[PDB]
Design an enzyme around this catalytic site. Structure first.
Site, PDB file in Angstrom:
ATOM      1  N   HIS A 188      10.762  10.979  -9.313  1.00 26.34           N
ATOM      2  CA  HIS A 188      11.675  11.873  -8.610  1.00 26.34           C
ATOM      3  C   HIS A 188      11.788  13.236  -9.287  1.00 26.34           C
ATOM      4  O   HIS A 188      12.555  14.091  -8.844  1.00 26.34           O
ATOM      5  CB  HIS A 188      13.062  11.238  -8.488  1.00 26.34           C
ATOM      6  CG  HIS A 188      13.153  10.192  -7.422  1.00 26.34           C
ATOM      7  ND1 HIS A 188      12.266  10.122  -6.370  1.00 26.34           N
ATOM      8  CD2 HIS A 188      14.033   9.177  -7.241  1.00 26.34           C
ATOM      9  CE1 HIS A 188      12.592   9.108  -5.588  1.00 26.34           C
ATOM     10  NE2 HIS A 188      13.660   8.519  -6.094  1.00 26.34           N
TER      11      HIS A 188
ATOM     12  N   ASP B 260       5.602  14.204   7.731  1.00 22.58           N
ATOM     13  CA  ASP B 260       6.489  13.481   6.838  1.00 22.58           C
ATOM     14  C   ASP B 260       7.941  13.855   7.138  1.00 22.58           C
ATOM     15  O   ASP B 260       8.232  14.738   7.951  1.00 22.58           O
ATOM     16  CB  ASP B 260       6.138  13.779   5.379  1.00 22.58           C
ATOM     17  CG  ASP B 260       5.965  15.266   5.108  1.00 22.58           C
ATOM     18  OD1 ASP B 260       5.904  16.050   6.081  1.00 22.58           O
ATOM     19  OD2 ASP B 260       5.883  15.652   3.922  1.00 22.58           O
TER      20      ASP B 260
END
Ligand SMILES: CC(=O)N[C@@H]1[C@@H](O)[C@H](O)[C@@H](CO)O[C@H]1O
Length: 330
Positions: free
Chosen positions: A172, A242
Protein backbone atom coordinates in the site's frame (compact mmCIF):
# COMPACT_ATOMS: atom_id res chain seq x y z
CA UNK A 1 -17.55 14.78 -29.35
CA UNK A 2 -16.10 11.41 -28.32
CA UNK A 3 -17.15 8.05 -26.89
CA UNK A 4 -17.34 6.87 -23.30
CA UNK A 5 -19.63 5.70 -20.54
CA UNK A 6 -19.83 5.37 -16.77
CA UNK A 7 -20.50 2.44 -14.43
CA UNK A 8 -21.42 3.27 -10.83
CA UNK A 9 -23.02 1.60 -7.82
CA UNK A 10 -25.66 2.19 -5.15
CA UNK A 11 -25.56 2.07 -1.36
CA UNK A 12 -28.47 0.06 0.00
CA UNK A 13 -30.56 -2.87 -1.18
CA UNK A 14 -33.28 -0.80 -2.86
CA UNK A 15 -32.92 2.32 -4.99
CA UNK A 16 -32.85 5.64 -3.14
CA UNK A 17 -34.34 8.86 -4.52
CA UNK A 18 -31.05 10.18 -5.90
CA UNK A 19 -30.14 6.70 -7.15
CA UNK A 20 -33.12 6.83 -9.51
CA UNK A 21 -32.23 10.38 -10.54
CA UNK A 22 -28.54 9.77 -11.25
CA UNK A 23 -29.35 6.64 -13.28
CA UNK A 24 -31.47 8.59 -15.77
CA UNK A 25 -28.41 10.26 -17.29
CA UNK A 26 -27.39 8.60 -20.59
CA UNK A 27 -23.67 8.91 -19.82
CA UNK A 28 -24.26 6.33 -17.07
CA UNK A 29 -23.94 3.05 -18.95
CA UNK A 30 -23.66 0.45 -16.21
CA UNK A 31 -24.19 -0.51 -12.60
CA UNK A 32 -22.25 -3.02 -10.47
CA UNK A 33 -23.47 -4.52 -7.20
CA UNK A 34 -21.55 -5.70 -4.13
CA UNK A 35 -22.33 -7.57 -0.91
CA UNK A 36 -24.11 -4.55 0.61
CA UNK A 37 -26.66 -4.69 -2.24
CA UNK A 38 -27.46 -8.42 -1.96
CA UNK A 39 -29.83 -10.12 0.48
CA UNK A 40 -31.95 -12.73 -1.33
CA UNK A 41 -32.30 -14.02 -4.90
CA UNK A 42 -35.85 -12.67 -5.12
CA UNK A 43 -34.57 -9.36 -3.74
CA UNK A 44 -31.70 -8.91 -6.21
CA UNK A 45 -34.14 -9.96 -8.94
CA UNK A 46 -36.52 -7.14 -8.01
CA UNK A 47 -33.55 -4.77 -7.65
CA UNK A 48 -32.63 -5.37 -11.30
CA UNK A 49 -36.28 -5.13 -12.34
CA UNK A 50 -36.51 -1.78 -10.54
CA UNK A 51 -33.52 -0.54 -12.55
CA UNK A 52 -34.77 -1.79 -15.93
CA UNK A 53 -37.98 0.15 -15.27
CA UNK A 54 -35.77 3.25 -15.32
CA UNK A 55 -33.10 2.32 -17.91
CA UNK A 56 -34.02 -0.76 -19.98
CA UNK A 57 -30.58 -0.51 -21.64
CA UNK A 58 -28.34 -0.38 -18.56
CA UNK A 59 -25.59 -2.92 -17.93
CA UNK A 60 -25.80 -4.80 -14.62
CA UNK A 61 -22.64 -6.58 -13.45
CA UNK A 62 -21.29 -8.31 -10.35
CA UNK A 63 -18.13 -10.08 -9.13
CA UNK A 64 -19.01 -13.78 -9.35
CA UNK A 65 -16.09 -16.17 -9.85
CA UNK A 66 -15.25 -19.37 -7.96
CA UNK A 67 -13.94 -19.48 -4.41
CA UNK A 68 -13.57 -16.52 -2.07
CA UNK A 69 -14.81 -13.92 -4.59
CA UNK A 70 -18.53 -14.75 -4.69
CA UNK A 71 -20.96 -11.96 -3.83
CA UNK A 72 -24.12 -14.02 -4.45
CA UNK A 73 -24.34 -16.51 -1.58
CA UNK A 74 -27.57 -16.71 0.45
CA UNK A 75 -29.56 -18.35 -2.34
CA UNK A 76 -26.86 -19.45 -4.77
CA UNK A 77 -24.78 -22.60 -5.14
CA UNK A 78 -21.24 -22.18 -3.81
CA UNK A 79 -18.83 -22.49 -6.73
CA UNK A 80 -15.33 -23.80 -5.99
CA UNK A 81 -12.19 -21.80 -6.62
CA UNK A 82 -10.95 -22.05 -10.19
CA UNK A 83 -7.64 -23.46 -8.94
CA UNK A 84 -9.50 -26.49 -7.57
CA UNK A 85 -11.02 -27.09 -11.03
CA UNK A 86 -7.58 -27.70 -12.57
CA UNK A 87 -6.79 -30.74 -10.38
CA UNK A 88 -9.03 -33.07 -12.41
CA UNK A 89 -8.63 -35.14 -15.58
CA UNK A 90 -12.00 -33.91 -16.89
CA UNK A 91 -11.10 -30.35 -15.90
CA UNK A 92 -11.81 -28.77 -19.30
CA UNK A 93 -15.51 -29.64 -19.32
CA UNK A 94 -15.56 -29.26 -15.53
CA UNK A 95 -14.65 -25.61 -16.07
CA UNK A 96 -17.17 -25.47 -18.93
CA UNK A 97 -19.99 -26.58 -16.62
CA UNK A 98 -18.78 -24.00 -14.09
CA UNK A 99 -19.06 -21.13 -16.56
CA UNK A 100 -22.51 -22.24 -17.72
CA UNK A 101 -23.82 -22.76 -14.19
CA UNK A 102 -22.43 -19.45 -12.90
CA UNK A 103 -23.83 -17.39 -15.77
CA UNK A 104 -27.27 -19.05 -15.84
CA UNK A 105 -27.73 -18.43 -12.13
CA UNK A 106 -26.61 -14.79 -12.10
CA UNK A 107 -28.68 -14.14 -15.22
CA UNK A 108 -31.69 -15.73 -13.52
CA UNK A 109 -31.72 -12.81 -11.06
CA UNK A 110 -31.67 -10.07 -13.71
CA UNK A 111 -27.94 -9.38 -14.05
CA UNK A 112 -26.31 -8.99 -17.45
CA UNK A 113 -22.69 -9.70 -16.72
CA UNK A 114 -20.13 -11.19 -14.35
CA UNK A 115 -16.53 -9.97 -14.33
CA UNK A 116 -15.08 -13.41 -15.02
CA UNK A 117 -12.87 -15.30 -15.57
CA UNK A 118 -9.53 -14.29 -14.05
CA UNK A 119 -6.69 -14.80 -16.54
CA UNK A 120 -3.88 -14.05 -14.09
CA UNK A 121 -1.13 -16.63 -13.63
CA UNK A 122 -0.72 -18.14 -10.15
CA UNK A 123 2.93 -17.47 -9.50
CA UNK A 124 4.16 -17.33 -5.93
CA UNK A 125 4.13 -13.65 -4.99
CA UNK A 126 0.89 -11.85 -5.89
CA UNK A 127 -1.63 -12.42 -3.09
CA UNK A 128 -4.65 -10.68 -4.62
CA UNK A 129 -4.77 -13.36 -7.34
CA UNK A 130 -3.94 -16.42 -5.23
CA UNK A 131 -6.60 -19.10 -5.62
CA UNK A 132 -8.65 -16.99 -8.06
CA UNK A 133 -6.47 -18.22 -10.95
CA UNK A 134 -6.42 -21.67 -12.53
CA UNK A 135 -2.75 -22.73 -12.46
CA UNK A 136 0.70 -21.21 -12.86
CA UNK A 137 1.81 -22.58 -16.21
CA UNK A 138 0.45 -20.23 -18.89
CA UNK A 139 -0.80 -22.30 -21.83
CA UNK A 140 -2.89 -24.65 -19.68
CA UNK A 141 -4.50 -21.80 -17.74
CA UNK A 142 -5.59 -20.27 -21.05
CA UNK A 143 -7.08 -23.61 -22.12
CA UNK A 144 -9.06 -23.96 -18.88
CA UNK A 145 -10.20 -20.33 -19.03
CA UNK A 146 -11.32 -20.67 -22.64
CA UNK A 147 -13.47 -23.63 -21.63
CA UNK A 148 -14.90 -21.50 -18.81
CA UNK A 149 -15.77 -18.83 -21.39
CA UNK A 150 -17.47 -21.43 -23.59
CA UNK A 151 -19.87 -22.18 -20.75
CA UNK A 152 -20.59 -18.50 -20.14
CA UNK A 153 -21.33 -17.90 -23.81
CA UNK A 154 -23.52 -21.02 -23.87
CA UNK A 155 -25.68 -19.30 -21.23
CA UNK A 156 -25.77 -16.04 -23.21
CA UNK A 157 -23.36 -14.08 -21.00
CA UNK A 158 -20.35 -12.14 -22.23
CA UNK A 159 -16.98 -12.83 -20.60
CA UNK A 160 -14.48 -10.24 -19.35
CA UNK A 161 -10.87 -11.23 -18.68
CA UNK A 162 -8.90 -9.91 -15.71
CA UNK A 163 -6.50 -8.35 -15.38
CA UNK A 164 -4.69 -7.17 -18.53
CA UNK A 165 -1.83 -7.59 -19.09
CA UNK A 166 -1.20 -9.69 -15.99
CA UNK A 167 -1.48 -9.39 -12.21
CA UNK A 168 0.28 -12.61 -11.19
CA UNK A 169 3.79 -11.24 -10.63
CA UNK A 170 2.94 -7.73 -9.39
CA UNK A 171 3.38 -7.72 -5.61
CA UNK A 172 0.00 0.00 0.00
CA UNK A 173 3.05 2.27 -0.12
CA UNK A 174 2.62 2.61 -3.90
CA UNK A 175 0.74 0.82 -6.65
CA UNK A 176 2.43 -2.53 -7.41
CA UNK A 177 4.97 -2.74 -10.22
CA UNK A 178 6.11 -5.50 -12.58
CA UNK A 179 9.62 -4.54 -13.71
CA UNK A 180 10.10 -7.11 -16.47
CA UNK A 181 10.95 -6.70 -20.14
CA UNK A 182 8.06 -6.66 -22.59
CA UNK A 183 9.72 -9.62 -24.32
CA UNK A 184 9.76 -11.37 -20.93
CA UNK A 185 6.19 -10.35 -20.05
CA UNK A 186 4.85 -11.58 -23.40
CA UNK A 187 6.46 -15.00 -22.89
CA UNK A 188 4.70 -15.46 -19.52
CA UNK A 189 1.71 -13.44 -18.27
CA UNK A 190 0.55 -12.12 -21.65
CA UNK A 191 -0.14 -15.34 -23.59
CA UNK A 192 -3.44 -16.17 -21.79
CA UNK A 193 -4.72 -12.79 -22.98
CA UNK A 194 -3.31 -13.53 -26.44
CA UNK A 195 -5.00 -16.92 -26.91
CA UNK A 196 -8.37 -15.66 -25.64
CA UNK A 197 -8.18 -12.23 -27.31
CA UNK A 198 -10.63 -13.19 -30.05
CA UNK A 199 -12.89 -15.08 -27.63
CA UNK A 200 -13.28 -12.55 -24.80
CA UNK A 201 -15.96 -9.90 -25.12
CA UNK A 202 -14.30 -7.50 -22.68
CA UNK A 203 -11.22 -6.95 -20.53
CA UNK A 204 -10.33 -5.22 -17.29
CA UNK A 205 -6.88 -3.67 -16.87
CA UNK A 206 -4.63 -4.25 -13.89
CA UNK A 207 -3.80 -1.43 -11.48
CA UNK A 208 -0.12 -2.20 -12.07
CA UNK A 209 2.79 -0.25 -13.57
CA UNK A 210 5.15 -2.01 -16.01
CA UNK A 211 8.15 0.34 -16.12
CA UNK A 212 9.92 -1.06 -19.20
CA UNK A 213 6.74 -0.61 -21.28
CA UNK A 214 4.79 2.41 -20.03
CA UNK A 215 5.28 4.68 -16.98
CA UNK A 216 1.51 4.62 -16.28
CA UNK A 217 -0.83 1.87 -15.07
CA UNK A 218 -2.32 -0.30 -17.79
CA UNK A 219 -5.78 1.21 -17.29
CA UNK A 220 -4.43 4.55 -18.50
CA UNK A 221 -1.60 3.54 -20.86
CA UNK A 222 -2.34 4.32 -24.49
CA UNK A 223 0.48 1.90 -25.34
CA UNK A 224 -0.93 -1.04 -23.35
CA UNK A 225 -4.47 -0.49 -24.64
CA UNK A 226 -4.21 1.08 -28.10
CA UNK A 227 -0.79 -0.10 -29.28
CA UNK A 228 -0.61 -3.78 -28.28
CA UNK A 229 -4.07 -4.80 -27.02
CA UNK A 230 -6.07 -3.57 -30.02
CA UNK A 231 -3.28 -3.59 -32.60
CA UNK A 232 -1.02 -6.51 -31.73
CA UNK A 233 -3.57 -8.79 -30.03
CA UNK A 234 -6.38 -7.57 -32.34
CA UNK A 235 -8.88 -7.27 -29.50
CA UNK A 236 -12.12 -5.79 -30.85
CA UNK A 237 -14.13 -5.84 -27.64
CA UNK A 238 -15.03 -3.66 -24.64
CA UNK A 239 -12.21 -2.20 -22.55
CA UNK A 240 -13.41 -1.65 -19.00
CA UNK A 241 -11.20 0.22 -16.54
CA UNK A 242 -9.87 -0.37 -13.06
CA UNK A 243 -11.62 1.18 -10.06
CA UNK A 244 -11.11 4.91 -10.64
CA UNK A 245 -12.07 5.50 -6.97
CA UNK A 246 -9.92 2.66 -5.65
CA UNK A 247 -9.15 2.69 -1.93
CA UNK A 248 -5.46 3.53 -1.59
CA UNK A 249 -4.91 4.20 -5.28
CA UNK A 250 -1.90 6.30 -6.27
CA UNK A 251 -3.50 8.46 -8.97
CA UNK A 252 -3.39 12.18 -8.20
CA UNK A 253 -6.45 14.19 -9.20
CA UNK A 254 -10.20 13.86 -8.98
CA UNK A 255 -12.44 11.28 -10.63
CA UNK A 256 -13.18 13.77 -13.42
CA UNK A 257 -9.60 13.53 -14.69
CA UNK A 258 -9.18 9.80 -13.99
CA UNK A 259 -12.05 8.90 -16.30
CA UNK A 260 -10.87 11.28 -19.05
CA UNK A 261 -7.42 9.66 -18.96
CA UNK A 262 -8.96 6.19 -19.21
CA UNK A 263 -11.18 7.10 -22.18
CA UNK A 264 -8.23 8.68 -24.00
CA UNK A 265 -6.19 5.52 -23.40
CA UNK A 266 -8.86 3.37 -25.05
CA UNK A 267 -11.30 2.48 -22.28
CA UNK A 268 -14.98 2.46 -23.19
CA UNK A 269 -16.54 2.50 -19.69
CA UNK A 270 -15.20 3.89 -16.41
CA UNK A 271 -15.77 2.32 -12.99
CA UNK A 272 -16.26 4.35 -9.80
CA UNK A 273 -17.08 2.01 -6.91
CA UNK A 274 -17.92 2.70 -3.25
CA UNK A 275 -17.65 6.48 -3.73
CA UNK A 276 -20.81 8.38 -4.67
CA UNK A 277 -19.28 11.87 -4.75
CA UNK A 278 -16.68 10.70 -7.28
CA UNK A 279 -19.42 9.27 -9.50
CA UNK A 280 -21.07 12.69 -9.79
CA UNK A 281 -17.69 14.26 -10.59
CA UNK A 282 -16.97 11.77 -13.38
CA UNK A 283 -20.55 12.09 -14.63
CA UNK A 284 -20.16 15.88 -14.80
CA UNK A 285 -16.94 15.47 -16.79
CA UNK A 286 -18.59 13.11 -19.30
CA UNK A 287 -21.50 15.53 -19.71
CA UNK A 288 -19.22 18.47 -20.48
CA UNK A 289 -17.26 16.23 -22.87
CA UNK A 290 -20.55 15.36 -24.64
CA UNK A 291 -19.83 11.65 -24.92
CA UNK A 292 -21.99 8.96 -26.51
CA UNK A 293 -21.89 5.26 -25.55
CA UNK A 294 -19.46 3.18 -27.62
CA UNK A 295 -20.97 0.83 -30.17
CA UNK A 296 -19.24 -2.15 -28.54
CA UNK A 297 -21.14 -1.62 -25.28
CA UNK A 298 -24.32 -3.40 -26.40
CA UNK A 299 -22.49 -6.69 -27.06
CA UNK A 300 -22.30 -7.07 -23.26
CA UNK A 301 -26.07 -7.31 -22.66
CA UNK A 302 -26.87 -10.71 -21.22
CA UNK A 303 -28.91 -12.82 -23.64
CA UNK A 304 -30.57 -14.54 -20.66
CA UNK A 305 -33.56 -13.30 -18.69
CA UNK A 306 -34.65 -13.29 -15.06
CA UNK A 307 -36.05 -16.81 -14.72
CA UNK A 308 -37.62 -18.42 -11.66
CA UNK A 309 -37.45 -21.99 -13.05
CA UNK A 310 -33.83 -22.10 -14.24
CA UNK A 311 -33.39 -25.29 -12.19
CA UNK A 312 -35.76 -27.11 -14.58
CA UNK A 313 -33.69 -27.24 -17.77
CA UNK A 314 -31.81 -30.55 -18.17
CA UNK A 315 -28.26 -29.16 -18.38
CA UNK A 316 -28.65 -27.69 -14.88
CA UNK A 317 -29.04 -31.28 -13.66
CA UNK A 318 -26.12 -32.64 -15.69
CA UNK A 319 -23.80 -29.74 -14.83
CA UNK A 320 -24.68 -29.82 -11.12
CA UNK A 321 -24.14 -33.59 -10.95
CA UNK A 322 -20.88 -33.45 -12.92
CA UNK A 323 -19.39 -30.78 -10.64
CA UNK A 324 -20.18 -32.55 -7.37
CA UNK A 325 -19.03 -35.83 -8.94
CA UNK A 326 -15.56 -34.28 -8.67
CA UNK A 327 -16.44 -32.88 -5.20
CA UNK A 328 -16.85 -29.21 -6.09
CA UNK A 329 -20.45 -28.34 -5.12
CA UNK A 330 -21.10 -28.41 -1.37
C1 LIG B 1 -7.37 -6.81 -8.67
C2 LIG B 1 -8.82 -7.01 -8.42
O1 LIG B 1 -9.20 -7.71 -7.53
N1 LIG B 1 -9.62 -6.38 -9.25
C3 LIG B 1 -11.03 -6.05 -9.03
C4 LIG B 1 -11.91 -6.73 -10.06
O2 LIG B 1 -11.75 -8.13 -9.96
C5 LIG B 1 -13.37 -6.33 -9.87
O3 LIG B 1 -14.16 -6.90 -10.91
C6 LIG B 1 -13.49 -4.82 -9.91
C7 LIG B 1 -14.89 -4.33 -9.62
O4 LIG B 1 -15.30 -4.75 -8.33
O5 LIG B 1 -12.62 -4.19 -8.98
C8 LIG B 1 -11.25 -4.55 -9.16
O6 LIG B 1 -10.46 -3.86 -8.19
Amino acid sequence: HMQGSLMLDIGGTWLTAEDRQILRHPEVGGLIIFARNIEHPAQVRELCAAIRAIRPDLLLAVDQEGGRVQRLRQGFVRLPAMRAIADNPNAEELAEHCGWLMATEVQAVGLDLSFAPVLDLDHQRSAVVGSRAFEGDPERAALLAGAFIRGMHAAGMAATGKHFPGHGWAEHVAIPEDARSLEEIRRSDLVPFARLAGQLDALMPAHVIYPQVDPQPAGFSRRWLQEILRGELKFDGVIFSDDLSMAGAHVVGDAASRIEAALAAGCDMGLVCNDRASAELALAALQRLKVTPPSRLQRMRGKGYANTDYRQQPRWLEALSALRAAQLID
